[PDB]
Design a protein around this ligand. Structure first.
Ligand code: AZA
Ligand code: AZA
Ligand code: AZA
Ligand code: AZA
Ligand code: NA
Ligand code: NA
Ligand code: NA
Ligand code: NA
Lengths: 295, 295, 295, 295
């Protein structure tokens, strides 16, 4: 036998950073969870017990805090690229660094209609993430994403005209609830290295904001023919608005809300046009995916 | 042996309700998870296999949907009281109904600066809850609460002057991070029955809003001497603003963020006045509780 | 306003301890999560910012590790009593210590039919817990429990003869699946103090084992008329087998498995006597509780 | 823009099946969670709102229950292959079916030293999984796995001789705790279709058992030089014992247990040879991966 693939490092490294503006007194916090896995000429640690090749995972954890101390942690696309570049430049035998970052929301509180200088609220478990793969000789590949964006519309969703055969019981509908947790990922064209990533820094936050805005607007305004049709409209718009994106991927659960027939109880009417009370279903759930790219 | 206490019913009943304004076209959704447990003359189901005394938990689930169909589901204090009153009035041998409700956030989306008619976002896992105990001959006891309100301030928190003995290693500090998940409960004076609960309906949402506002303001503005001292200031204000509240209880974890000494690496300075990067600690955590009532 | 109740301390303190037998070379590990909350004359930390009264929660965490270093951690009833007694004896103004312990399973591995000296497996998320309240002048109150014991029987469960009215749709049944997660708690008679707790040490593990054995046997052998009737039989036996127990409490969810009617598809028969494939329901669930004590 | 990739179906379909032996009276239960995603000529549902191409996810859910009704659900490799083959044969425009199955433990209870006929216990959250990709014209690809196997050894683990530079603080050690959650996957050589999968049925359970046995034995007996070195020994053995496996992949967290220096308290000795009480760390954690194949 032989090692066909190997990667190792530190996962779940929680990091917080505060920036303090001495002029204004305003403080801004950033909190993230970071994973860094390395690849390179490390097979012998597995096959020969040769630890000489191992940059200890504890050392990777130290490096993450040090890098956060010496560099900006925002946008995460930049931080991730700096962190990945560090490992492949620092260590001759390490040839790829894979950096995943999950950013947690700390939104400045408004107290009495004015932004507070140093207090924050976690407004939702929605995350902004990046995956950065820094590979020696092959540049920097970045996938950015939002996830945990949970939405619901109570009408203007339809689902009819689907295949019907001896396995089908679902009724066609022209008015249903649609609810999902949005996972959207946009993949950047490959960057030659850190200098190029730095040159595009303003695009990272702008594109994240555009992706979120397009998602929310389209979800709210599309009179939806299906999850499929609505997510395609979202991805289409993101690609149109940022030329440095190569592909947009969406993964959307269909979180079902079922009508409850109550007519068995005093002829109570609670279905179709009369449906007011529904039973949210924890499982199963539809799962709909698509990756959209350029013609 | 003898049955000393017994209660039974249905937990985790997810309920969604939509209200549709035909004039304006505006829709509003409510989603909750409900638990109803009953007590009464039911010992024989346990001791004699006498199921004749059991209102089936499946029937309790049906009743919850029916009651939501025929009544307002908001404020939850009212819905809970209606649901509990139903069981003790309907069934001669059932003498107490215990109703817990967790309300989930569905906040109307703003699209292009205007409130959307029928699309919503889950902005945070914060909940509004009620516990309603409806006991025959003893009225209606209601505890209202907010929970899962996660906040952080990056400065204006101190902790010094605590007991020091041979078990103490913690250093005194005059500037730290304070972060918590707020659980706050206010207990209403006992109500004689449903008519009285109905008569106070406007106070339920107002008091919930006041509790939340007081929590956020005090947390943000108090130059905090301890979690203890800050939570007391919160509870004091709520009691001052609503005379129908008997007690306010707070339970606050202290979610620690630890300085990371980096001076071992090139004399890098990251502690005290120089602390920028911190390690959020998943566990352990301080846990601080208090119940405040009237002089 | 006034402080009506207050308690504070450290939650989620993970502790592992290893015992090494130098003769045999055999090692045994214990892992627990501990919470200690204190009460006493501490109101002024809340009302006056008087930290002088606060034994820091960080110091409580240190004490837990120190106590585990100097004492046995098993049975947890003893460890908890030692830890609680420490705080009320050490500190004049602290008058109650509330200690909760959750013990995690590390079961010695059998390798080639023989018990391995120092390797262990987590065989299930089942826990053994204790709550110990050590109150100055009032002795030591101990509640012991098992939780997370998840079981299922595929037949020999019935449910018929329940109340039927205009809220009832559930059909009577003489053969169903019964599945639950067992939470069982036994409450010890009050102990005068640590010496008495020490004097009963052998009873703690024996009673835990008896409670578990009785639970499993009764669940498996009772042709069950209801969850109510089966849990009562369990509690009855535990009380009969240990005279130092005052009460036994059970809390059992009814985790429903629903028949799936498939007759719409080629007249396929999958209900009643023909039911083979079922849909486990994540929610809602029955919840059945009882506390049994002595005549 | 254009659809570059798309797949959709039903996730989180919980399925239970009971087999009843009429001769012996013995019952055996199986419980699983199933996901089926389809691919084929379905782009127009995304781009043109053409639902005509969509086999409804609700219909996929029906098919899963029907297939479980008419076929064995064990071994899951077979069930998955039957389920995937169904969709690509039944539907002309569907060309790939991706089936994931998670099997949940229901272990027959022993009551009084004898196996009970119809009662079961969930002994651990360990799972057995399969991923089956059934692709028209390309046969059946099966990856089998175990996950959630949580183990710990209290000694006979070492970690020394790793790279030391200006980022390193970790001390070398010749005796530590090693604890992990095992995720192991073995990939079968491609099968031509269902007939070939059927022909190898006895190998599926045998190989699963071998993988588990090898994992436990090696973990317990290896005097481990690193996680890397130990996992390689595991994968090497599995490949040696089953020629139909092409690759074995392991993903192992290093769940750290930290020494606690207590010497600040009365010179108490709790490090190195004296270490008895440790602090299990929830995060961060090492993460070590490798894929081993044939020379
Ligand atoms: O087994 C280990 N492998 C590693 O790569 C490592 N890094 N720190 N500790 C470690 N332990
Ligand atoms: O065992 C049961 N007890 C109950 O109270 C009940 N209600 N529905 N099904 C039930 N099963
Ligand atoms: O606010 C605090 N209260 C306490 O009781 C405590 N103990 N350690 N740090 C602390 N912080
Ligand atoms: O939007 C939907 N897409 C689907 O593929 C589907 N199948 N059932 N309901 C559905 N809804
Ligand atoms: Na390199
Ligand atoms: Na009554
Ligand atoms: Na005392
Ligand atoms: Na096909």
């Amino acid at each position: 036998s032989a090692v066909k693939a190997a990667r190792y490092g530190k996962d779940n490294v929680r990091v917080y950073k505060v920036h303090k503006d001495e002029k204004t007194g305003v403080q801004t916090v950033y909190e993230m969870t970071v994973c860094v896995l390395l690849e390179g000429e490390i097979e012998t640690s597995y096959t020969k017990a040769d630890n000489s090749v191992i940059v200890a995972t504890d050392s990777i954890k130290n490096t993450i805090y040090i890098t956060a101390k010496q560099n900006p942690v925002t946008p995460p696309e930049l931080f991730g690229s700096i962190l990945g570049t560090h490992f492949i430049e620092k260590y001759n035998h390490i040839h790829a660094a894979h950096v995943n970052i999950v950013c947690h929301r700390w939104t400045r509180m408004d107290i009495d209609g004015k932004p507070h200088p140093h207090s924050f609220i976690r407004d939702s478990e929605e995350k902004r993430n990046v995956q950065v793969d820094v590979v020696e000789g092959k540049g920097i590949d970045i996938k950015s994403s939002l996830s945990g964006l949970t939405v619901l519309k109570s009408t203007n969703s339809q689902f009819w005209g689907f295949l019907r055969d001896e396995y089908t019981t679902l009724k066609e509908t022209w008015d249903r609830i649609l609810s999902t947790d949005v996972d959207a990922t946009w993949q950047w064209k490959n960057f030659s290295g850190l200098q190029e990533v730095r040159s595009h820094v303003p695009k990272f936050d702008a594109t994240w904001a555009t992706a979120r805005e397009v998602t929310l607007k389209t979800f709210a305004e599309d009179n939806s023919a299906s999850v499929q049709a609505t997510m395609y409209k979202m991805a289409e718009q993101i690609l149109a608005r940022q030329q440095l994106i190569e592909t947009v991927e969406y993964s959307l659960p269909n979180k079902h809300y079922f009508e409850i027939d109550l007519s068995w109880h005093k002829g109570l009417q609670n279905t179709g046009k009369n449906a007011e009370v529904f039973a949210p279903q924890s499982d199963p759930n539809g799962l709909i995916k698509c990756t959209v790219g350029r013609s």
